[PDB]
Design an enzyme around this catalytic site. Structure first.
Site, PDB file in Angstrom:
ATOM      1  N   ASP A  68       6.693 -11.357  16.061  1.00  0.00           N
ATOM      2  CA  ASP A  68       7.111 -10.286  15.158  1.00  0.00           C
ATOM      3  C   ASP A  68       6.785  -8.893  15.693  1.00  0.00           C
ATOM      4  OD1 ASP A  68       4.219 -10.698  14.250  1.00  0.00           O
ATOM      5  OD2 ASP A  68       4.828  -8.980  13.015  1.00  0.00           O
ATOM      6  N   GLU A  69       5.780  -8.755  16.562  1.00  0.00           N
ATOM      7  CA  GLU A  69       5.648  -7.501  17.294  1.00  0.00           C
ATOM      8  C   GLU A  69       6.661  -7.450  18.430  1.00  0.00           C
ATOM      9  OE1 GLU A  69       3.035  -9.094  15.861  1.00  0.00           O
ATOM     10  OE2 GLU A  69       3.246  -7.361  14.511  1.00  0.00           O
TER      11      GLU A  69
END
Ligand SMILES: [Mg+2]
Ligand SMILES: [Zn+2]
Ligand SMILES: [Zn+2]
Ligand SMILES: [Zn+2]
Lengths: 228, 150, 43, 110, 146, 67, 765, 151, 183
Positions: free
Chosen positions: D91-92
């Site tokens: 998700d980063e």
């Protein structure tokens, strides 16, 4: 150069993956200047300069004949023709089984003779033939390989993939004043505890300088001081 | 059974790995509006797009806008789907910008926003992680019998 | 071999030392989801 | 050696008999190849292992980009070798590692 | 890209029919790898440079990258121009099948398309092989972290 | 489940247009777009409220336990 | 509009999915189990005998599930939703026919229930088979529910598809500073073992079996297996290549180093090292013990005095070793998808029921001995009250193994955990994605990342984005959309066909010519050699396309390892593919016209030779076109639809090819946690936890996948009006701004339902 | 081959035929027939198959009246219906351009060479009579023959 | 453009093929000398072949070692079990016609050191058992079926094969389409 490297440094493990010995030289040339040192630090050269090996039998005499090629020994810059090859053969085949009289018929055709619960002579001759083209005649038997490097200049430094720092330091044509290895424990046993902590600090700092990790050098200095 | 209003800290996601909690809940009049008075249900930061590189989300917004304006559900199939030129043609035919960027007015100042705002429908999923089941606080209470610790 | 002896109580991440002596659960603590707040002072 | 009998095809060996004859007897089968002024030689070639040239550097073949290094005051480098890795959760975004072409200083801009 | 592909396949046919000048530091098989990778990286960098130089004033990704709040010129160029080359384990994608990366390419083919070079950008969409190569590259980064 | 009473974004009543939209689709068939425009759903929020609705209540009623 | 093959060949995917749903691995595996494997167990364990009373036996004649002979209908099964509600097991009775002798020479049949068989949902025996949504309404079951799980004690349990390295197949691996070891994990129907094979030192080659005390040198075993000439040994393992000869000569020398050998001398040498057999049949401790040792050294069970097959198998083992020692990169990737197999629920339950039935028969014989050890009045009448009482153990074990996931198989001797998981009910997509989920083999040394990376060979077979996060990242994999798993078919009628097609048996083949032609392998075993390997492959493929052999048999040719490989075992992953002949596709849109018209369901494209299944290994021999536009006249197949490389969950993503791959992976993660609609009977369900959206909307931008899996019928989300802008400062770092008065009007409004179960337990007093 | 490590020539010590790794494949095809020396994946196969027809026809011509030569034929184990199968079954035909065929029954098949047997082959007869068990020699095999049905 | 007929025959003939893997078909240009045969043996119910070929005595015999190590070594024993394979038909040409005789239990013969066996057993001298165990149990229990190697009678066999090849003639009727499934 990462977590395993920092782990090796701070664990002070005696065996490390890729122990590199950086050795600066005295002269500035490739032909007959730096290849000479590279040859002075090499793993094994029998197979490199044997060009074949024989399993010879006669009525009552047995030969292990090898024809060292002067062409390879000249093109690859090494200092050896016959006698040191013979004595190295004696030492290695003694460490394996035995060696009492290694003869040289001449013209690079050095022959090794074997003589004495049966067929053991043939078995030992076969094992000598197999273990022959693997022995060290030139160079320190601690260096897996050496490789000439360029520091973005006309200086051809060589760094070796071995575990012996004192030998490389004392080798001819290598400046011992500026010759460091990345193995902290090797530095410690050869140069001292102060050089050991210097090596620790330089190794850790460099390790985190190749990952952009901006740590103040005082932390690394304290780590080295508490380690040494 | 327990009804649950979406509140602060509830997690939402948008089919492109762009998750995040509700940071604030603001009144409708404070929300920016377009010429027809359409007001967003969700405002999502532009800073989530450049680094995650979710161009699929932008194409989804444009295709969904063209689809709602055309009366048809669109397709975003892998290696296929509704072409961007067709969706832009639908958008232009109905009076909108080809790139899905409409001019909004500020809900709190009333003025035109100095930048055109990417405006359109995006499918958003409410995720099972609600802050009501995560908020926990202890002052004193039950202790382990063996160790006398909380 | 699930039999938990005395040295099993002391050894391990959830043993005695690393689980209760150096590091333990504390009173007057809380945990919940974090949300942004710009109108909050940085401290 | 690596020779075998014609009768039982087993591997032949050298044995020392009477008068020290180095006959190629075949074990398991009455076969006897004596040596009467005949030379049995087994030659196998070995590699030359030619020289190896300087390691040098092949940084010409490495992806560059237009980024000024943090040490711009010391070296005015407008370019930096890069490679992207996703060393965060999925998700980063990805992480980009840099290396100034003017000083070699490495840094990660994430 | 077509100019770059031409040099790549010229080197391919030279390597296949004969023997190229092996680099001093590495053996034969990877000298073609180094040459092709350098050429593809150069074409990706040049195309991205053209894209960035033609970028509009008030471009949102460009502003975020210029002020440093989020993203970079790499991200902008990957979105707009070209997602250059999928690199796993330090080199191009190795053979997943026998002497070949995917069955959608000829056997013992080392063209840029066959070994991870994604011609497309994220705006235009990834063709199925390029999509798979990109997935492996992302997985390679995610792996080891655990 | 059932058509929401108001559009989520505008607040315009769309719960009184579901049956009319269904009848426009079935009786005297129209396109979905022109059937939405015939009902007065000009804004795309009110359009999506009807276009993307899934009438799950008719499926839930197949399991009515007090027949 | 005229059908265009380029854009209408995609309809083969809905055609395939109509008869072969996403949850079909579990379904077919369980149907195969209950239909043929139960007969196989009852016919393996067909009779039990006692030492006393020889004029007496018990015979298991027939086995059935859920049906009796009294009536045409099956028995009433409490429906699966009622089983869920009442916390019981959805099971059907196992009926057998018993031939137990009466004391007065009377022979009869019977229909006796020996336990309850947990029935998988929507299988043949399941009551929801071929229901029309009206009987599903009456049974309070969701028509869109996947099926393929078990309800034991009211909880939905799924036997996850199991990844594991292929058995009965040679795998060769190298190593640094240690040597080369290469095993052949051979599994029999009653004994599994791995014939390890490593190079100890000095380039000496050894065979290392668990039952053997010390690793027997390779020349010794080769001489033992009939190949005792010591030149044909080197010929078989070395061929005409000069390097391998000197690589191998050391262990040739050792063969005479100890003492010159006949076959039986080597056999005695092998037999001296056999460990033990629990001190039974002690009178076998001779040279003959090696016969059992070599019989139980591999799967190539020898029932005669010819050892050629095992000899050539071990010679190939050795030659692969020698190739690896000559140079690495001759090893196989242990993470290559062609080298793995998928065990399924039916196979798992087959072996579990076999173990439970062996326990049941042992206990029944114990009870029979205890009853009939009495001297007088040994009345035979109603000797089945014991089995009436004793039927509870099979049911108890069969239920508990599924309930807990721990499978204690005494016979095969291992303990495995996590075979079952609770079926997730967070979302309809969560349940469907727990179906078609693959769990990889544990004891994998998770510190490394070999079986964690994504492989190019999983293209179209395993989903390229549905891999989970956190800890099992790369260990749990998901099936692609358009995929089939092969089933075990008989290998004997294919060996005869191979001999017909020009393969000469190895017993007809000499050692000196073995590595001069291609050698044909059946399931990894050298059955013979053939001239014209490419013609043989083409004729075999033509026979398979014309239906003369099963469509699931895979044939491919390796050139580096000169071999034509034919695989018939189940568990291989395969996907359908359009056959491209003479530079043209075989569908040519008349078949597509028929297909949309209703004729030519997907099976007929297989019967007609237009579409064939390709496993990972045949894809080596194939050359697939992604599109009809780039079909060059050297390609062998054409993709039906390239979007099938994503699974069911990854098909929820609009325009995934425009995203960075980690975003697709994270959406595969979050889509299973999305809150929405669960089922048409969600308000009749009573679950431990359930999140439901009040106003779920179907996505405005959908895909073909979400309508192929009926995601638009139970969606999980809403089409929010989104403005992409910086606002209020409360949206930094993934934080969102939510409209009040959209929340007031019901946007995002969900609810949670939690169940609490209590039992008023009666006590002894 | 490569370098060979140098009363009856058949009783002299026998060494394996050794070929270097760099050229194992090329010499492999040369010695597949040269080791006997009897008295592209589609085109190469077809041309070598046509050479197999020419060699097979040569061998049938030189076997016409020799009272010692035998061939072994590989027939399918389930022949077309007409073992208790006796009499004439069919014909082996020589087509134009040098290619052959076999008509075992109403069907038409092709005929190939199969693997070469670089070792002695001899056929014998087993007659175990209750009066006297005797073994009778008949001849020696000159080559294997493989006939394959074609669809 | 010619036709060559093949005819099946030898319905009762037990025609075995010997495969001497120990010696090449031809060392040089000419075919190798067919070795002399003596003291051949066969074990029924086991299909075990034992064939003895004497060693030459004028060269390469090592007579002293031979007699000092093993009592009888004059013959050389090649042992190999006949393997039952189908579809292997032996052929010859007589009158532009190839005459086929089915082959029963081809065998692969490898040298056998029975004298080493007996020397070892004399050194060492100072229960269904079914399966492969039963095979060797049968081989070493029920054995000793001596055979008489009668070499030379080919003409009788050949004229016999022709006799069953001309008196009988059968035609084929099975459909080609049916044959493919019959494969
Ligand atoms: Mg995060
Ligand atoms: Zn011998
Ligand atoms: Zn710099
Ligand atoms: Zn509205």
């Amino acid at each position: 150069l990462g977590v395993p490297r920092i782990k090796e440094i701070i664990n002070a493990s005696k065996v490390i993956s890729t122990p590199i010995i950086n050795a600066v030289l005295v002269n500035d040339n490739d032909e007959r200047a730096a290849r000479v040192v590279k040859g002075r630090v090499e793993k094994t050269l029998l197979s490199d300069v044997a060009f074949y090996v024989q399993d010879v039998y006669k009525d009552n005499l047995s030969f292990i004949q090898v024809r060292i090629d002067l062409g390879t020994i000249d093109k690859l810059q090494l200092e050896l023709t016959i006698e040191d090859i013979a004595v190295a053969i004696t030492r290695a085949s003694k460490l394996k089984i035995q060696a009492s009289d290694v003869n040289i018929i001449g013209k690079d055709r050095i022959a090794i003779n074997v003589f004495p619960s049966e067929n053991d002579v043939f078995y030992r001759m076969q094992q000598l033939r197999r273990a022959l083209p693997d022995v060290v005649v030139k160079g320190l038997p601690d260096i897996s390989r050496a490789v000439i490097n360029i520091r973005d200049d006309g200086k051809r430094e060589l760094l070796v993939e071995g575990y012996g720092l004192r030998d490389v330091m004392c080798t001819d044509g290598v400046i011992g004043s500026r010759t460091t290895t990345n193995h902290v424990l090797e530095v410690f046993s050869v140069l001292g505890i102060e050089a050991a902590r210097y090596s620790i600090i330089r190794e850790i700092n460099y390790t985190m300088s190749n990952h952009g990790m901006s740590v103040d050098p005082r932390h690394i200095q304290l780590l080295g001081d508490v380690m040494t | 059974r327990q009804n649950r209003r979406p509140e602060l800290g509830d997690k939402f996601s948008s089919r492109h790995g762009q998750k995040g909690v509700c940071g604030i809940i603001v009144k409708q009049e404070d929300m920016p509006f377009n010429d027809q008075g359409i007001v967003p249900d969700i405002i999502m930061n532009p800073h989530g797009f450049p680094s995650r590189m979710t161009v699929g989300k932008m194409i989804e917004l444009i295709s969904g806008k063209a689809g709602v304006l055309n009366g048809t559900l669109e397709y975003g199939t892998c290696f296929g789907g509704s072409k961007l030129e067709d969706m832009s043609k639908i958008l232009v035919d109905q009076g909108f910008n080809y790139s899905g960027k409409d001019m909004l007015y500020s809900g709190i100042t009333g003025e035109c926003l100095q930048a055109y705002i990417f405006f359109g429908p995006i499918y958003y999923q409410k995720l099972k992680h609600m802050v009501l089941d995560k908020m926990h606080a202890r002052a004193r209470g039950p202790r382990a019998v063996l160790t006398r610790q909380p | 071999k699930p039999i938990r002896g005395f040295c099993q109580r002391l050894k391990g991440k959830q043993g005695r030392f690393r689980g209760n002596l150096s590091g333990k659960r504390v009173d007057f603590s809380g945990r919940t989801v974090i949300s942004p707040d710009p109108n909050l002072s940085i401290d | 050696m690596l020779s075998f009998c014609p009768s039982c095809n087993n591997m032949l060996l050298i044995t020392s008999g009477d008068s020290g004859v180095y006959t190629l007897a075949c074990r398991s089968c009455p076969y006897e190849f004596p040596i009467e002024g005949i030379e049995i030689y087994d030659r196998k070639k070995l590699p030359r292992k030619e020289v190896d040239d300087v390691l040098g550097g092949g940084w010409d073949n490495v992806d560059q980009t237009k980024t000024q290094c943090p040490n711009y005051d010391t070296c005015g480098g407008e370019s930096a070798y890069f490679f992207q890795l996703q060393i965060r959760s999925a998700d980063e975004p990805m992480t980009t590692f840099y290396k100034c072409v003017n000083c070699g200083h490495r840094w990660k801009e994430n | 890209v077509e100019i770059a592909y031409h040099k790549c396949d010229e080197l391919i046919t030279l390597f296949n029919k004969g023997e190229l000048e092996t680099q001093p530091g590495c053996n034969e098989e990877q000298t073609l790898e180094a040459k092709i990778g350098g050429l593809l990286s150069k074409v990706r960098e040049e195309v991205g440079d053209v894209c960035i130089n033609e970028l509009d004033n008030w471009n949102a990704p460009l502003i975020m990258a210029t002020c440093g709040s989020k993203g970079s010129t790499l991200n902008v160029s990957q979105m707009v121009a070209v997602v250059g080359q999928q690199i796993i384990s330090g080199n191009r994608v190795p053979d997943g099948f026998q002497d070949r990366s995917l069955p959608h390419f000829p056997k013992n083919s080392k063209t840029p398309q066959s070994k991870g070079f994604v011609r497309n950008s994220f705006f235009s969409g990834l063709s199925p092989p390029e999509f798979l190569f990109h997935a492996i590259s992302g997985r390679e980064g995610l792996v080891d972290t655990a | 489940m059932i058509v929401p009473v108001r559009c989520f974004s505008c607040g315009k009543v769309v719960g009184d247009k579901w049956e009319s939209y269904l009848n426009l689709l079935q009786e005297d068939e129209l396109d979905e777009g022109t059937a939405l425009s015939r009902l007065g759903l000009k804004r795309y929020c009110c359009r999506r409220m009807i276009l993307t609705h899934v009438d799950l209540i008719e499926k839930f009623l197949r399991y009515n336990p007090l027949e | 509009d005229e059908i265009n093959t380029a854009q209408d060949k995609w309809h083969l995917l809905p055609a395939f999915l109509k008869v072969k749903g996403l949850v079909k691995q579990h379904l077919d595996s369980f149907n195969y189990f209950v239909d043929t494997d139960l007969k196989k167990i009852i016919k393996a364990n067909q009779l039990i005998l006692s030492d006393v009373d020889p004029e007496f036996y018990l015979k298991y004649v027939d086995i059935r599930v859920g049906k009796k002979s009294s009536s045409s209908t099956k028995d009433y099964l409490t429906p699966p939703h009622e089983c869920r509600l009442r916390d019981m097991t959805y099971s059907a009775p196992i009926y057998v026919d018993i031939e137990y002798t009466r004391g007065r020479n009377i022979i009869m049949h019977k229909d006796v229930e020996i336990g309850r068989m947990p029935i998988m949902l929507r299988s043949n025996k399941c009551i929801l088979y071929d229901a029309d949504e009206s009987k599903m309404a009456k049974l309070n079951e969701c028509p869109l529910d996947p099926g393929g799980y078990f309800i034991v004690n009211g909880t939905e349990k799924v036997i996850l598809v199991q990844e594991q390295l292929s058995k009965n197949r040679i795998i060769v691996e190298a190593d640094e500073k240690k040597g080369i070891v290469q095993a052949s994990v051979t599994s029999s129907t009653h004994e599994r073992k791995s014939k390890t094979y490593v190079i100890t030192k000095n380039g000496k080659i050894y065979l290392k079996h668990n039952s053997i005390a010390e690793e027997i040198p390779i020349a010794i075993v080769l001489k033992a297996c009939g190949i005792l000439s010591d030149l044909e040994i080197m010929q078989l393992v070395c061929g005409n290549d000069s390097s391998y000869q000197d690589i191998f000569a050391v262990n040739l020398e050792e063969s005479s180093k100890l003492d010159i050998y006949t076959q039986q001398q080597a056999l005695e040498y092998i037999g001296a090292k056999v460990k033990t057999m629990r001190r039974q049949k002690l009178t076998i401790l001779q040279e003959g013990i090696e016969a059992i040792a070599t019989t139980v050294i591999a799967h190539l069970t020898v029932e005669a005095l010819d050892f050629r097959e095992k000899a050539l198998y071990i010679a190939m083992m050795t030659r692969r070793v020698v190739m690896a020692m000559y140079n690495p990169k001759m090893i196989d990737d242990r993470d290559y998808v062609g080298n793995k197999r998928l065990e399924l629920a039916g196979q798992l339950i087959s072996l579990l029921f076999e173990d439970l039935f062996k326990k049941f028969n042992n206990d029944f014989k114990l009870s029979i001995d205890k009853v009939l050890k009495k001297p007088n009045r040994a009345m035979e009448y109603d000797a089945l009250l014991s089995i009436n009482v004793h039927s509870n153990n099979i049911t108890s074990g069969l239920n508990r193994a599924i309930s807990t996931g721990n499978w204690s198989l005494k016979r095969f001797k291992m303990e495995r955990a996590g075979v079952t998981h609770v079926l997730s009910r967070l979302s309809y997509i969560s349940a469907l994605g727990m179906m078609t989920r693959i769990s990889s083999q544990f004891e994998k040394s998770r510190k490394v990342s070999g079986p964690r990376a994504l492989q190019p060979s999983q293209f179209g077979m395993l989903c390229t984005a549905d891999t989970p996060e956190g800890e099992a990242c790369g260990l749990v994999k998901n099936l692609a959309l358009m995929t089939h798993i092969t089933t075990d078919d008989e290998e004997e009628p294919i060996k005869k066909l191979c001999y017909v097609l020009g393969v000469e048996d190895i017993t007809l083949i000499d050692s000196a010519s073995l590595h001069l032609n291609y050698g044909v392998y059946l399931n990894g075993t050298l059955i013979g050699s053939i001239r014209f390997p490419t013609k043989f492959v083409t004729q075999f493929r033509h026979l398979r396309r014309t239906g003369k052999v099963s469509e699931f048999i895979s044939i491919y040719s390796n050139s580096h390892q000169m071999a034509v490989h034919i695989a018939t075992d189940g568990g291989r992953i395969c996907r359908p593919l359009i056959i491209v002949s003479d530079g043209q596709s075989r569908v040519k849109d008349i078949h597509l016209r028929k297909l949309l018209d209703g004729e030519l369901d997907f099976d007929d494209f297989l019967k007609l030779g237009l579409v064939e299944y390709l496993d990972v290994n045949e894809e080596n021999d194939s050359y697939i076109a992604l599109y009809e536009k780039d079909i060059v006249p050297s390609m062998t197949h054409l993709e039906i639809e390239p979007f099938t490389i994503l699974g069911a969950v990854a098909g929820l993503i609009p325009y995934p090819h425009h995203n960075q791959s980690p975003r697709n992976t994270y959406q595969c993660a979050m889509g299973k946690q999305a809150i929405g609609a669960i089922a048409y009977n969600q308000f009749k369900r009573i679950d431990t936890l359930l999140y439901l959206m009040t106003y779920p909307q179907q996505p405005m931008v959908k895909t073909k996948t979400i309508e192929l899996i009926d995601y638009d019928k139970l969606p999980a989300g809403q089409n929010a009006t989104v403005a992409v802008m910086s606002y209020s400062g409360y949206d930094i770092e993934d934080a969102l701004v939510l409209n009040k008065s959209s929340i007031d009007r019901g946007f995002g409004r969900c609810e949670t339902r939690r169940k609490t179960t209590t039992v008023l337990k009666r006590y002894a007093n | 081959x490569x370098x060979x490590x140098x009363r009856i020539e058949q009783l002299f010590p026998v060494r394996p035929v050794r070929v270097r790794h760099e050229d194992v494949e090329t010499v492999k095809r040369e010695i597949q027939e040269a080791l006997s020396e009897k008295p592209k994946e589609a085109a190469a196969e077809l041309e070598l198959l046509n050479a197999d027809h020419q060699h097979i026809l040569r061998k049938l011509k030189k076997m016409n009246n020799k009272p010692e030569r035998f061939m072994v034929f590989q027939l399918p184990t389930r022949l077309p219906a007409f073992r208790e199968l006796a009499g004439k079954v069919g014909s082996i035909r020589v087509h134009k351009s040098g290619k052959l065929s076999v008509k075992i029954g109403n069907v038409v098949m092709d005929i190939g060479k199969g693997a070469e047997t670089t070792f002695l082959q001899d056929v014998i007869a087993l007659s175990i009579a209750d009066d006297a068990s005797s073994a009778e020699l008949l001849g020696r095999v000159d080559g294997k023959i493989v006939v394959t049905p074609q669809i | 453009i010619e036709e060559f007929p093949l005819k099946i025959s030898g319905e009762e003939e037990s025609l075995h093929v010997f495969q001497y893997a120990n010696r090449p078909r031809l060392v040089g240009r000419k075919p190798a000398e067919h070795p002399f045969i003596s003291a051949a043996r066969y074990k029924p119910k086991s299909h075990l072949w034992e064939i003895d070929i004497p060693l030459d005595e004028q060269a390469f015999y090592n007579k002293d070692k031979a007699e000092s190590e093993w009592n009888g070594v004059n013959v050389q024993t090649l042992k190999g079990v006949g393997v039952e394979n189908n579809g292997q038909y032996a052929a010859f040409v007589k009158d532009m016609q190839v005459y086929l005789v089915p082959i029963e239990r081809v065998a692969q013969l490898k040298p056998f050191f029975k004298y080493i066996d007996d020397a070892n057993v004399t050194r060492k001298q100072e229960n269904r058992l079914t399966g492969s165990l039963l095979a060797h149990k049968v081989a070493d229990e029920e054995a000793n079926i001596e055979l008489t190697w009668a070499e030379g009678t080919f003409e009788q066999f050949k004229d016999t094969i022709v006799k069953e090849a001309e008196d009988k003639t059968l035609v084929a009727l099975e459909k080609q389409e049916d044959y493919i499934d019959n494969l």
